């Protein structure tokens, strides 16, 4: 029983979730960013 | 002995491990995004 | 020669890595979850 | 060979994915490092 | 045979960027859990 088909498929998921988790992470980046940003400003420092 | 049958698996964990890696992820952003909200609102800054 | 065998081996230490990372994932959102739940109560702001 | 082409295409975008996720993770690290001494500095404190 | 060589060489490439990810993830989660206990003990809040 041939399956390269299935694996085929199992490895274009894999790209699917990893794009997924690269968009979630580049936005995290910016969400640190940001905080890290603020709390410099915050006079109370 | 054809190892196809046990690469399909590995691929297959591979996934499944994956989809669990991203909706930790999701949940996280999720946190680390109210975290920001909270101290760009917070009074001392 | 065959490099099947090979190949199988980098998907079980791959799936071993991410089996890794999905526990330190699972850890660094109980610690971000609580660090929010600290600046939550912040009496600073 | 038949679907081995694109088998061989998925992981190398999957290793370029990888890349890039490793490159974002290492600026997280960064800002969270600074974030970290930044209020390990904080007179506020 | 096959495209086993190029296959197996991405793999390769695959494990060596994951291992850095784990180590990367590892050193983060240390310094969230330092920036935890360094708010938990901030007079401030
Ligand atoms: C029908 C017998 C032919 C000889 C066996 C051919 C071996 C390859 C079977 C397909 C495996 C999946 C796709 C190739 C990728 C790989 O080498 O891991
Ligand atoms: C042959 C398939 C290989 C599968 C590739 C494994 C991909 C793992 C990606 C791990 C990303 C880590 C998530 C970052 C966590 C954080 O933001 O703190």
Redesign the pocket.
Known sequence: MDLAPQMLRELQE?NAA?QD?REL?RQ?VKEITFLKNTVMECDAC
Chains 1, 2, 3, 4, 5 share one sequence.
């Open positions: 894999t990893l988790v992470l995290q």
